[PDB]
Structures are given as structure tokens and as C-alpha cells.
């Protein structure tokens, strides 16, 4: 939302995306799948 391209990520984007993708996001995926994999039929 500045200069020319209005979608240039902020300098803090890496300090958020990298932590979320690799620690938080994976935990949700592993836990959600774990429940489905063990889900009874």
C-alpha cells in the first residue's frame, strides 16, 4: 500500500509468516489429521 506495487509485504511479514508457517500452522494440521486418522468408523 505504498510506492508503486500496493501489495509489497511489510518488513515484519517474515517475522510473522515464518514463525506461523513451521510452528503454529503445522501443529494445527498434525493435530487435526491425528484426530481424523484415529477417527473411529
Amino acid at each position: 500500500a505504498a510506492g508503486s506495487y500496493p501489495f509489497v509485504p511489510p518488513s515484519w511479514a517474515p517475522s510473522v509468516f515464518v514463525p506461523l508457517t513451521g510452528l503454529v500452522l503445522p501443529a494445527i494440521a498434525m493435530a487435526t489429521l491425528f484426530v481424523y486418522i484415529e477417527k473411529d468408523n
Binding site: Y5, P14, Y36, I37, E38, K39, D40
Partner: protein, 732 residues
């Protein structure tokens, strides 16, 4: 009780062991086996799956453009492509220490970054991109395309938009549309980019979306094309004094046939690349108008195949009864596709090192090396899949009564001939190719280099002289100007092809010596052996004296028991499993020959390769040991530099490679009994007995461990080499 994870496989769903989780991920994209699978539903599912893969490819490409634009040095590299190093992305590692943060700041940045070896920069420059906006716009565009394909996967799976099996089996039309539209109209369309954007940009003139409808690609315009005087578009070519991206030395031609490479870029000329796509586009469109559709004029494929039976009856019923075989078998088609794609994947690597198709591509040695090795390895895996799916076709979808006397059924008739003859060639190549390496090594060790046998590759040198190589002094065809071919091309690409082929600072037809003779025959041994393994498995896929009912046992089965001595690795899955190792060995030798031939070319010490390669000891000490000196010193007790990641990966590759051995050397049994003891301990342990496993812990399956060990083995061979190939080429 029964689980839901393996929805497709109720057997796995009811499996009380943990194997259900492992197999559920494997037997996942084998719909042909899924519970309740119809041929039409299978095709519809595959068709949608294709859209999904197309969404990933475009999303993957958009990400590269985005990171190159947001975290890159494109404009800076474009200004000085022979000094600036293309930046792929930034390293936000919350674990990096301060020396790591300092050492990885390179290529002109304010933080730790990763230089790119994909060569996207050189390519995007040559095609017209000059700023970061061009990258952002492209990324958004490709991202939108990815979204469209994703909706299409949904649309084509929702009743009323799900194609019938008949549409999936409409070959004549599909081929016509793909050849004319997908291949032809996408080549003429590309000429339209080149002629309108790439060529003008290379001559310094922004022709973007803002002024393309008002900028004449050629000064005369479409007049010459309409008047038939097409030549006007091949006059005033860019002079040698031309500078890419500058009007300096810029000409006015749009389509020409100069040949060779631009002097500064050292890469094929754009105009010659424009006329290429125009010429091929015309052929593709005309070729598209061949098979029959819904109008009348046309060729029915079935008729062509059935009308081709040798009158001497040497090929039996010839190709009669083969159209249904290919049209009703999705493994036969996939095998042909993988074989075709695999082979062409190799042409891209063999034709992109010799003829750099992108500006300043040759300058970037690390890119060149990492691009050859990438395609050559990907090609090898694709080829293994070709034969693999071919064996599946023999068992899952081959009707021995319909194919009776056809060229496909008269192959198993001489299956032993094909297999045995592939054995003799492999042994001959093996016994001799190695014997003349040990013989030379012995002479090197006994200080008798003159006594070492060095056969000259005269046959290849003549093919080089035929193309115009003069060093050899054979005066053949193009080498002899007074010839017919030489005189005919003298007014076209010939003047350039020679200048370029007779320059030893590039890779067009590099001088070959007796060292290349031995390695080339070694490559042949790998090609023949790997082939023999896959061919033997394919022919014996549903038949064999040891296991005459292999088809009844399917494709992937561990063994038929210890009966008849040993049936270990008797499934046609195990011809693939074993062929993979030989494929890696073969590609290993080819990507090691490229790297050394070229590292010696780039360092200026061509005599190094022309002599050390003759004996194997030279390949280890002069190549692997000498080049590994820097990579291994990425991090030492005194400090660390930017090559630390490659040193860490190099060791990491060895670890994954060694781990793969356990799953291959050790077998299911010692582990199973060991797991039994572990189960007992946990049930008896107090405070831990409270927590328990929902799935019974079992050892990896016999076939499962084969693939798990092979994945570890392959991953290693790739990471260990990728580290070397990049950290040794970059270190210098």
C-alpha cells in the same frame, strides 16, 4: 474398531495395525484399486487431479516471481548481470547466530539472503522483464490462473460438467486440438511476445501493456507479410556491437536465421528464436488438421494402425488391434508419455548447455551446472516411471486374446531374446569399460602413463567435423567449404554456426579426447543395464518359471515365500526398485562428467581433464577430493562463511543416504520381534501404561521398507551432490 482414514480401502480401514496409516497415504492415488471404482469415474477423478497439479505449478511459479520481486536484486542484476548475483529469497532463521547473519548478506542486501541457481533471472531478462513490477504483475496473473484451474477441478467433478468416458476416449480430436492449439497457437503466440516485447526490450524500448497496441514491431509493419516480401523482416539484424537491453548496435530485424549466439549475451539470438517459434507453430497447426473430427475430411487412427502389417508377416498382425489397447489402457498411455517427456527432458539439458538460450546464462557457471543436473536427474526418474507403468499395463490392462499376433504380443514371444541380448551388451560394456580404467590406473600407479590404453573417439570426432569442427582436420561436409551442404548454408546460419563451434571458450561441440571415450561407453553401460532391469521386470511382469501366476499376485507383492529356494524381490515392483539404483549410478556418472569437463573448461585447465579423467584415481583426487576442499570448510573451529548451509547439507545428505541402507540391508523380523518387546515394556511400565496406542505398533511392510530406504537413499544422492555441484562451482 474400524477407522475412517483409509476411506478408499475398507481393508486398510479395518486394519488394526499402524500399516493402515502408511498404506492409506500410498494406495491413495491408485484409484483403479479404490473400492467401487468405475472407468468413467476414474477418468473424471484423474482429469480433475490434473487441474490440481496445474494449480500447484502456476502457484509455485508465482511464488518465485513474488520472492524475486519482494526479496531480490533483479534490477541491480539486470544492470550488471556479470557481477551481481541473482538473489532467490531472504533467510529469516530465528536460530541464526550473528556470524551467520553477517556471512549470508551477499548479492547486495541488508539481511541474510540466498543466491538463486535456478536461472530464472537470466530467463526473465531475455523475455522482456526489466523491473520488479513486471514480476509482481506476472505473479498475480499466474496466481489468478492457479485459482481458475482450482475452480475447474471442482466444476468438472460436479454433475453436468463431469466428462463422459466417451469424451475421455476421444483421441483423434484431443490430439488435433493439442497439436494445433496447445502446441501451435502457443508457439505463434510466443513469437508474438518475442517480436512485440522481448526483441524491442532487448533493443532498449519499453513495449508493455501500456503501448503495445501502438508500437510497430517492425518499421515496415505487416505490409511485407501481406505483400509476401517476408524477407523485409530479416534485414538489418542486431550488429555484434549490440548490447542486450540497449539500442547500442540494435537492428530492425524481427525474424532471421543468423545462428550461433549474441556476442555480449553469448546466447542464441532472439530474432532466430522468434522465427523458430513461428516456423514450428505453422507446422503444429497444420499437423493438428490431420485426424478426423465431426466434419468429414480426416484420418481415423484405428485404420492407420490396422493398415500397417508387414506383408512378409514378420511382425505378425502388425499394429492391428492396438488402438483399443492404447485407448482402453491408461498405463500404456502414461508409459509412452513418461518415455517421451523423459527423453525430451534430457534434450533440454543437452541443448541448453551447448546453446545457452538465455542472456548471460553461460557466464553463470553455477546456474548452468545446477540446471543440467536438475533436468538430467528428473529425466531419469521419469524414465523409470515409463517402464514402471508399462509393467502395470502388462498385468492390469493387457488382453492376451485381443492382442493375438500383434507387435505387442510377439514381444513376449521373444522376451528371452530381448532380455538376454541386453545382458550380453551390458556384460561386454561392463567387463571392458572398467578393464581399461583399472589397466590405466595400474599404469599410473607403476609410473607408466605411456603404457595406459587411450582409444581415440574417432567416430564422434567425425560427427563433430561433419558439423564444422576443424581441430580434428578431417575436412568433412561443413568442415569442407567446397561441399554442397557447406555452400548451401553459407548464406544462412552457417557463417555463425562455425564461428561459434570453432570457439573453445564455449560449449558448442567441445573437443573430445580419449578420456571422453571411456566415460561415454560407461554411460552406455548404465543406459543398457538400467534398461535391462526395467525391461526384464516389464516382460516378466505377469509370467516367469519361478512365479507363473505373477499377474494373479498383482504388481506390488513382497515375495512368494521361501519356497522354490527364494522368491525374494520377484514382483515387477522390484525391477523398478532395483533399476532406481542403477539409474542414480548412470546419471551420477553423466553429471560428474559434465561438471569436470566444464570445471576444467572454466578454470582454463583443460589439460587437467584431458589427462586425469583417463584413469579413475584422477576422478576422485582431482575432482571429488580437490573440489570438496572448500565445501567442507563452510564451518571450521575458526569461523564460518556463506558456504556453511552447503557443508551442513552435504553431511545431511550422507546421513539420509546411510539411513536408507538400514531399511534395505535389514529386513522385517528383527524389528517386528523388537517392537513386540517394546509393546510389553510400555504395558508394564507404571504411570505410562495409562497412555496407550490406538493403532497396534507393527514393523514397516516388506515392500514399504524397500521404498522408504530407497527414498532415503535417493534423497541423499541428490542433497549430497546438489551441495557439491553448487558449493564447488560457486566457491570459485
Amino acid at each position: 474398531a474400524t477407522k475412517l482414514f483409509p476411506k478408499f480401502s475398507q481393508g486398510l480401514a479395518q486394519d488394526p495395525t499402524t500399516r493402515r496409516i502408511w498404506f492409506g497415504l500410498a494406495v491413495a492415488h491408485d484409484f483403479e484399486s479404490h473400492d467401487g471404482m468405475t472407468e468413467e469415474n476414474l477418468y473424471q477423478k484423474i482429469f480433475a487431479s490434473h487441474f490440481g497439479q496445474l494449480a500447484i505449478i502456476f502457484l509455485w511459479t508465482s511464488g518465485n516471481l513474488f520472492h524475486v520481486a519482494w526479496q531480490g536484486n533483479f534490477e541491480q542484476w539486470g544492470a550488471d548481470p556479470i557481477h551481481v548475483r541473482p538473489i532467490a529469497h531472504a533467510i529469516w532463521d530465528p536460530h541464526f547466530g550473528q556470524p551467520a547473519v553477517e556471512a549470508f548478506t551477499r548479492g547486495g542486501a541488508s539481511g541474510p539472503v540466498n543466491i538463486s541457481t535456478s536461472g530464472v533471472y537470466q530467463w526473465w531478462y531475455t523475455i522482456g522483464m526489466r523491473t520488479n513490477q513486471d514480476l509482481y504483475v506476472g505473479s498475480v496473473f499466474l496466481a489468478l490462473v492457479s485459482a481458475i484451474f482450482l475452480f475447474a477441478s471442482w466444476l468438472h467433478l460436479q454433475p453436468s460438467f463431469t466428462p463422459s468416458l466417451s469424451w475421455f476416449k476421444d483421441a483423434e480430436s484431443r490430439l488435433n486440438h493439442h497439436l494445433s492449439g496447445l502446441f501451435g497457437v502457443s508457439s505463434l503466440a510466443w513469437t508474438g511476445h518475442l517480436v512485440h516485447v522481448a526483441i524491442p526490450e532487448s533493443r532498449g524500448k519499453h513495449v508493455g501493456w501500456d503501448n503495445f497496441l501502438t508500437q510497430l514491431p517492425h518499421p515496415q509493419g505487416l505490409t511485407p507479410f501481406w505483400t509476401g516480401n517476408w524477407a523485409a523482416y530479416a534485414q538489418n539484424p542486431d550488429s555484434a556491437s549490440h548490447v542486450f537491453g540497449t539500442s547500442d548496435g540494435a537492428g530492425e530485424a524481427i525474424l532471421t536465421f543468423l545462428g550461433g549466439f549474441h556476442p555480449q549475451t553469448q546466447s542464441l539470438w532472439l530474432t532466430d528464436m522468434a522465427h523458430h517459434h513461428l516456423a514450428i507453430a505453422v507446422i503444429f497447426i497444420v499437423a493438428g488438421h490431420m485426424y478426423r473430427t465431426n466434419f468429414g475430411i480426416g484420418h481415423r487412427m484405428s485404420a492407420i494402425l490396422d493398415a500397417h502389417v508387414a506383408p512378409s508377416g514378420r511382425l505378425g498382425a502388425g499394429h492391428k488391434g492396438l488402438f483399443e489397447t492404447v485407448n482402453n489402457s491408461l498405463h500404456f498411455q502414461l508409459g509412452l508419455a513418461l518415455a517421451s517427456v523423459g527423453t525430451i527432458c534430457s534434450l533440454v539439458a543437452q541443448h541448453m548447455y551447448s546453446l545457452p538460450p538465455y542472456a548471460f546464462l553461460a557466464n553463470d557457471f553455477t546456474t548452468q551446472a545446477s540446471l543440467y543436473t536438475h533436468h538430467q536427474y528428473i529425466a531419469g526418474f521419469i524414465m523409470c516411471g515409463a517402464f514402471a507403468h508399462g509393467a502395470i499395463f502388462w498385468i492390469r490392462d493387457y488382453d492376451p486374446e485381443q492382442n493375438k499376433g500383434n507387435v505387442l504380443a510377439r514381444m513376449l514371444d521373444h522376451k528371452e531374446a530381448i532380455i538376454s541380448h541386453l545382458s550380453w551388451v551390458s556384460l561386454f560394456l561392463g567387463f571392458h569399460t572398467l578393464g581399461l580404467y583399472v589397466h590405466n590406473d595400474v599404469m599410473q600407479a607403476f609410473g607408466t602413463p605411456e603404457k595406459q590404453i587411450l582409444i581415440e573417439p574417432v567416430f564422434a570426432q567425425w560427427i563433430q567435423a561433419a558439423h564444422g569442427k576443424a581441430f580434428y582436420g578431417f575436412d568433412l561436409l561443413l568442415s569442407s567449404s567446397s561441399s554442397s551442404a557447406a555452400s548451401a548454408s553459407q548464406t544462412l546460419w552457417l557463417p555463425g554456426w562455425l564461428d561459434a563451434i570453432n570457439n573453445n571458450q564455449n560449449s558448442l561441440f567441445l573437443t573430445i579426447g580419449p578420456g571422453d571415450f571411456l566415460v561415454h561407453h560407461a554411460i552406455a553401460l548404465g543406459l543398457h543395464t538400467t534398461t535391462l532391469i526395467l525391461v526384464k521386470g516389464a516382460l516378466d511382469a505377469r509370467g516367469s518359471k519361478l512365479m507363473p501366476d505373477k499377474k494373479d499376485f498383482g504388481y506390488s507383492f513382497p515375495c512368494d515365500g521361501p519356497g522354490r529356494g527364494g522368491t525374494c524381490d520377484i514382483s515387477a515392483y522390484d525391477a523398478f526398485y532395483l533399476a532406481v539404483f542403477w539409474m542414480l549410478n548412470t546419471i551420477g556418472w553423466v553429471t560428474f562428467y559434465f561438471h569436470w569437463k566444464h570445471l576444467t573448461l572454466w578454470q582454463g585447465n583443460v589439460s587437467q581433464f584431458d589427462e586425469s579423467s583417463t584413469y579413475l584415481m584422477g576422478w576422485l583426487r582431482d575432482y571429488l577430493w580437490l573440489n570438496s576442499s572448500q565445501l567442507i570448510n563452510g564451518y571450521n573451529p575458526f569461523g564460518m562463511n556463506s558456504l556453511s548451509v552447503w557443508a551442513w547439507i552435504f553431511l545431511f545428505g550422507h546421513l539420509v543416504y546411510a539411513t536408507g541402507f538400514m531399511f534395505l540391508i535389514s529386513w522385517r523380523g528383527y524389528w517386528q520381534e523388537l517392537i513386540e518387546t517394546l509393546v510389553w515394556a510400555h504395558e508394564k511400565t507404571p504411570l505410562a501404561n495409562l497412555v496407550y496406542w490406538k493403532d497396534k505398533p507393527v514393523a514397516l511392510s516388506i515392500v514399504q521398507a524397500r521404498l522408504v530406504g530407497l527414498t532415503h537413499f535417493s534423497v541423499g544422492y541428490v542433497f549430497t551432490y546438489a551441495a557439491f555441484l553448487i558449493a564447488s562451482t560457486s566457491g570459485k
